[PDB]
Amino acid sequence: HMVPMDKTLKEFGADVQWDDYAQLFTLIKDGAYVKVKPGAQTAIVNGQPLALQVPVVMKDNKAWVSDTFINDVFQSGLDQTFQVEKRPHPLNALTADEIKQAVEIVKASADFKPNTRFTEISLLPPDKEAVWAFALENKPVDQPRKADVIMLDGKHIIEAVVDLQNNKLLSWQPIKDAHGMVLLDDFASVQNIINNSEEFAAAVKKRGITDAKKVITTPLTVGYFDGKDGLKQDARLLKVISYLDVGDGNYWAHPIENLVAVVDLEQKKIVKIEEGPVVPVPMTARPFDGRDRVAPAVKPMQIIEPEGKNYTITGDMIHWRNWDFHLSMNSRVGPMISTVTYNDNGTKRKVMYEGSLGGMIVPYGDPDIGWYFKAYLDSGDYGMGTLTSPIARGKDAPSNAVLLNETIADYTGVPMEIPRAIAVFERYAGPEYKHQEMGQPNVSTERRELVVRWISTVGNYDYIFDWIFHENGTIGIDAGATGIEAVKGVKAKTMHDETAKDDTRYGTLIDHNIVGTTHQHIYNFRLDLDVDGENNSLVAMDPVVKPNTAGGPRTSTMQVNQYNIGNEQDAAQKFDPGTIRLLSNPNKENRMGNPVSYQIIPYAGGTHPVAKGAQFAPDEWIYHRLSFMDKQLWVTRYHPGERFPEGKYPNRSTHDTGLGQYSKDNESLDNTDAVVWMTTGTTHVARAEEWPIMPTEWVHTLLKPWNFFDETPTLGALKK
Amino acid sequence: MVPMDKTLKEFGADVQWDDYAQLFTLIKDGAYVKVKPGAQTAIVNGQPLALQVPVVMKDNKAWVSDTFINDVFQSGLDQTFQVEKRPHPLNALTADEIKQAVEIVKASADFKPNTRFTEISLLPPDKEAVWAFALENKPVDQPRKADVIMLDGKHIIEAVVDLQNNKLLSWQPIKDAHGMVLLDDFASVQNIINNSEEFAAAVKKRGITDAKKVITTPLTVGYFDGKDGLKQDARLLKVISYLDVGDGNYWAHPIENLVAVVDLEQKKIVKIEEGPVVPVPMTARPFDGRDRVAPAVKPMQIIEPEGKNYTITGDMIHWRNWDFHLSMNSRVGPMISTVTYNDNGTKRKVMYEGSLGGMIVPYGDPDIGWYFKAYLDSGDYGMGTLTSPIARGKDAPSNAVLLNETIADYTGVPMEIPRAIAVFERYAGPEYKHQEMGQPNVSTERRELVVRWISTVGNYDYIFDWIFHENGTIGIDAGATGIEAVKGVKAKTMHDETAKDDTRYGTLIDHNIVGTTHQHIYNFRLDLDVDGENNSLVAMDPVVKPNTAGGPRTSTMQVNQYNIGNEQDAAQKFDPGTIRLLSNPNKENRMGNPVSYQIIPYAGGTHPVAKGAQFAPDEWIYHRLSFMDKQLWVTRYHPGERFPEGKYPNRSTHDTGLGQYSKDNESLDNTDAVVWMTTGTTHVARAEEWPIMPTEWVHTLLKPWNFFDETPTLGALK
Ligand SMILES: O=CCc1ccccc1
Ligand SMILES: O=CCc1ccccc1
Ligand SMILES: [NH3+]CCc1ccccc1
Ligand SMILES: [Ca+2]
Ligand SMILES: [Ca+2]
Ligand SMILES: [Ca+2]
Ligand SMILES: [Ca+2]
Ligand SMILES: [Cu+2]
Ligand SMILES: [Cu+2]
Questions:
Q1: Residue B14 — left, alpha, or beta (φ > 0 → left; ψ -120 to 50 → alpha)?
Q2: What DSSP string describes B203-218?
Q3: A582 neighbors A660 (Cβ within 8 angstroms)
Q4: Residue A289's closest CA among B708, B443, B429?
Q5: How far is the CA of B484 from the centre of ligand 9 (A)?
Q6: What is the spatial order of strands in the sheet that B506-510 belongs to?
Q7: Cβ neighbours of residue B572 under 8 Å, at least 6 residues apart?
Q8: Region Disordered: start and end of each range (chain A)?
Q9: Cβ atoms of residues B483 and B495 within 8 Å
Q10: How far apart (Å, rounded) are the C-alpha atoms in residues A386 and A171?
Q11: Which residue in B has a C-alpha nearest to residue A250's C-alpha?
């Protein structure tokens, strides 16, 4: 029998286009670009003919297809974008079965508990050398597949390691003084607790709210304040900031200011309620989904690749032009780009062994009761991988993108497949190079970039990360921010009201009775670059103006001060965009005798004002707990266990267990395996243009080959 | 009948044949046509068109009526271009006006026989009247006038002509002003050198067996208060030479330490400076691919089958909420004028005029052949004149519309530059997004309208993009590519004896070739009128202040706001961590905040950033060009102050540009301000940039700040 074509294809997630003049359907879905005419015995898939067992049938202006059409067409093989992996890559993320296997192993332990949740279940990384050998030499990794299983028993963290190959538990280590990240069920627990609190209902009522059932809570981490916040360090707590649901789909626009409830999770009870001055809840409807807006007419624009893509995805490995890399998903930091090599005329040269988001922080600058503790570590305390937002096909990524599904474990240890978790797409990026010699034929070539995009939403903020592989060897990493701002309810409607000045001391008045509290967005990327090998050195090149000592009219010259940065301590520094910092390989040179290197650029621009460091006095704890905030460049000795800038267990941490810890011994960085950490951020002073919803703002970082090659990388294959 | 593919391609249209669909897809600029052989109708931008003669297949060769292109492409179904019934007052001089102006000055008894024209451009009507035309359709009751700047030998004369009444209004010789370099000067230099026995003698001394293979370059000499031993009153140019080896890239073969000084009026070398002899790098280094084979790539197309979202009426461009005027100038290229943002039905002023102000590419090597090297490409060579036609689909995306522009050449004859400017819309990620947990997603795509212009002066190719974002933001990017200026050296690798000395002022990017360090400094003149003429410059510096409200916090994040009341204070370095606004103290948004635009001189770049001029304050280039050392300048609107480097920068003895425009330190309080943004890079070369440099970009931004009352892209309320 058959089924309606449009409905079915839309359900399938394919774009359906009908050309009445040509009597032709054009179907697009990831790497598949299809053309089919009603009644035709064949269809075209990426330029190749495909025989259909059932032609598309047109009835009374309605098209119908066989129930096997989607499978026969989209899984024909003529779409070669995806290929089957014959030999499993050692860095492949844990499969659904493996996740379940790990969960069974720990549950076989006599110590496992019923309320035991899983903060993270991820592959235990085999030794770096074995992995590189596999990627380059194709040598098998004779080491057993293992998995780290981090459990949360009540409020206690337990680190267990399971041997998946031999289905046996290898370790069970409780981690004292460590708090666990926030889990999904905590979100519902908070709302439930507030709903059952007689006092809170009373607190809310005196603040103008009649129906407490319309109150929406949010689970915020409290941080650490040596007790000044009056909170027992031992307990698993969360502060609750509330909003009123007015039915406009945007409760963020209706803050219940000066009301904070402290909740003890294991005790499932409100242990404290801080109250400040009563501020009337901003009530005006402020929808952002367009319900109250007119839809402007816009002409269609399509980016198409009718014969398929230039990249191939074998398993989790992506091949594109001279690039080869592995892409996997982690519940905490999201995407991980591994074993990155650049094919130099037949020879695959190492570039980066492992790269990913290190961690990030969004600290606010308002001292009041509902803001002073607010300093989010989104990936660390909330798991950005877990909170991945599926790509909106054609909107969050260009129409010519390919969308990948990714699987991770949820907090209960059950496999979870995130649909459209990552977008991959090639894009035109202007001319690669050009030269119009006067009176001569022009010379131009277009530039192409391969983008790997991932979006994660943690509450009100929506973050976008793009890993950009330039055909010329350059690698870019951009971070975009959008979503809804965290606002403060105030009494002033305009800057002319009496309280305006005081209401706007820590933020801009972006709407009536609404202030966009000033804050920063500080991102950090962990980049284990192995420039043409593991042993590298950090070199500095500072352009300077020195007195002319060669005679002639000039009083000055442009020269460069070059020196090595031999230790981690000296490598942790602010970044001057006017200087040059290289991660060189002192063991290999290019054709001119220069060490093959990559230029590290932590700050390549941004659309919001740039964060020169953490906007905190040096005597604030957040500044103390988190040191990665103040430096834009860090370089440490390779260590498989050092992966997070804010530390492994940042929730209510008492001291820096991250980059401050990784570089505290000030080890040598001379001709050894280095790991680069780039920190880049923005300072956000709000404006009306960003409310009710904020246009995407971006920050850019860059990694450029510096004498890594012997000439223009994109000139092409040498004819003679 | 006539062959389709042959005719269509001569027309410049792209032809695609789909055998499965038996359909031809024809594309050219805003027209997207679909036609099947034998069909009595065709489709143009989604609309049906009746054909007089169907397309016919003859021996697998399609044929069309001899009137096909006109009937289809000029049908009217492609609405990209609309007729301009009332000419915009800022329209550039037409070919007829260029010839009229030349006839007017040539009729004067003072016009000498071989006089050339450095520039022939529209003399701008008063701003007020122009705004009234754009906002009120009010006619400009002032005759079209043209500035005619002549070069009589080496003497500059400024004339003004009344085009409407066809009469000469003024004729003023400009004392001590040197004229820019003109095209014929390039040939003179080469011919003068070619006929120089002494030069040929010097060249032989340096290993060149055939002097006829020597390629010259016309370089401005600057000013060094005589220390360079050059006569200030003479029209001079220094000549740096290269050896043509037949690889199509003479730039890769420098004849180091050989500099000839040519007096253009005497037409002869008046000085030859010789330094140590360095063997000419000989290895062929073509950049045009003659020795390469590109990897096969799958096709990519960006299509708009229903036409464009923008309309071009004459030179007026309408797109979404934006409306602006695009014109061409021989010196600075494109000019963006009368820019307004249609705020829910009401057009609000944003920028009266915007364009490249000027730029300079100064080097940091003290040696004989480099110390004077400081290029003012627009000012001294005329970048609009040297516009490089856009290579369709490569220099600009496949969905772009390419515009032709007309200017006058140095002999006063109209010159049409094909594909001089590219206009194209592009996807730029999501405009905004919010995925509320467990709720339906909300995402809208971002669209940007780009106006791209490319100019090439010698070895460098410069790209400029004026980017209009739907949300009111305006971006201005500058890209650099082309061939690097290199110094011939003895070292082949860094292991050679002279390596250290050879690389003191630049990187060794090839054997015996050093890419001398230099900077790229661009300056943009932006006459912003934020929702009106009268504005004020306001600073907002984010600062950390002690907490005085109580609680655990010791510090807070506050802003230090203050006005910058005068030109001298407005001339400043830009801290990308601070905020600088051009506000309209007379208008506010719904929250009582002054409608403003955020000025961002530095929004990013792919090359190291230039914090200022890499020159000691006692260097003459530094004294002559103050604009290089500050990223932000704000001056009072004046019709005759348009160039950061001054009107006549060739061998100038002092700053007649921004240094002069602000020397007076006038008030910037609630008045007509003009913003000048200086953004630059410091270029330290690498092997990856040779023989041809992959495009490097710098970015600037102008963002609406409380100009609107909410997210500008949400749309009108139902
Ligand atoms: O995103 C940071 C903490 C948070 C989590 C959930 C809702 C609001 C805020
Ligand atoms: O671009 C600056 C001066 C110049 C002009 C012509 C050829 C080479 C260099
Ligand atoms: N007075 C305008 C200049 C002009 C000259 C000749 C034809 C058309 C226009
Ligand atoms: Ca260490
Ligand atoms: Ca490394
Ligand atoms: Ca002035
Ligand atoms: Ca102005
Ligand atoms: Cu923000
Ligand atoms: Cu350069």
A1: beta
A2: HHHTT-S-GGGEEEEE
A3: no
A4: B443
A5: 7
A6: B486-488, B513-516, B506-510
A7: B564, B630, B631, B632
A8: 645-666
A9: no
A10: 25
A11: B436
In Å, how far from its chain's centre is CA B662?
24
Can you count the helices (H) and strands (E) in chain B? 10, 41
The DSSP secondary-structure symbol of B667 reads: B
Query: Which residues in chain B touch residue A706, judged by CB atoms under 8 angstroms apart?
Result: 686, 688
Query: Is A50 in contact with A78 (CB distance < 8 Å)?
Result: yes
C-alpha to C-alpha distance for A65 and A59, rounded to whole angstroms: 11
Q: Say which residues have a Cβ less than 8 Å from residue B492's Cβ, sequence separation at least 6.
A: A592, B511, B512
Q: Which amino acid is at B24?
A: F
Answer whether B281's CB lies under 8 Å from B206's CB. no
- Check: CB of residue B519 under 8 Å from CB of residue B513: no
Buried b (16+ CB within 10 A) or exposed e, B139-170: ebeeebbbbbbbbbeebbbbbbbbbeeeebee
φ and ψ of A189, to 5 deg: -60, -45
- Residue B297, chain A, CB below 8 Å: the answer is yes
Closest-CA residue, ligand 3 atom 6, reads B96
Place of tokens 């030794």: A127
Based on its alpha-carbon atoms, the radius of gyration of chain A, rounded to whole angstroms, reads: 28
Q: Do A607 and B435 touch (CB under 8 A)?
A: no
Rounded to whole angstroms, the Cα distance separating B322 from B155 reads 43
Q: How much helix, strand and coil, in percent to the nearest 5, is found in chain A?
A: 10, 45, 45
Q: Dig out the tokens for A615 from the structure.
A: 């906007």
Q: A441: exposed, middle or buried (C-beta count within 10 Å: 0-12, 13-18, 19+)? A: exposed
Half-sphere exposure of A629 (CA within 13 A, CB side): 25
Token digits for B551? 């609680």
**Residues forming a β-bridge with A596:** A585
Catalogue all structural domains in chain A, each as residue range(s) with its CATH number. 1-79 (3.30.457.10), 81-181 (3.10.450.40), 182-287 (3.10.450.40), 309-718 (2.70.98.20)
Task: List all residues 6 or more positions away from B433 whose beta carbon is below 8 Å from its beta carbon.
Answer: A389, A392, A395, A396, A455, A462, A464, A482, A483, A696, B441, B442, B443, B444
**CA–CA gap between residue A718 and residue B693 (Å, rounded):** 18
Residues A221, A293 contacting (CB under 8 angstroms): no
Chain A contact present for B296, CB below 8 A: no
Q: Name where chain B breaks: residue before each gap, C-N > 2.5 Å.
A: none
Rounded-to-integer distance, Cα B682 and Cα B606, Å: 11
- On whether the CB atoms of residues B516 and B485 are closer than 8 A, the answer is yes
The burial of A241, by beta-carbon neighbours within 10 Å (0-12 exposed, 13-18 middle, 19 or more buried), is given as buried
**Alpha-carbon distance A294 to nearest alpha carbon in chain B (angstroms):** 5
The reply to whether A156 sits in an annotated binding site is no
Tokens of A636: 């440490």
**CA-based end-to-end distance of chain A:** 60
Q: In this structure, are residues A519 and A488 in contact, taking their beta carbons and an 8 Å threshold? A: no
Atom of ligand 2 nearest to the CA of B186: 6
3-state DSSP call for residue B74? coil
| A539/B180 Cα distance (integer angstroms) | 43
In a 10 Å sphere around its CB, with 0-12 CB exposed, 13-18 middle and 19+ buried, how is residue B66 labelled?
A: exposed
Q: What is the CA radius of gyration of chain B?
A: 28
Residues of B in contact with A306 (CB under 8 A): 299, 301
Torsion region of A57: left, alpha or beta (phi above 0 gives left; psi -120 to 50 gives alpha) = beta
Cis peptide before A547 (omega within 30 of 0): no
Q: Is A518 at the interface with chain B, CB within 8 A?
A: yes
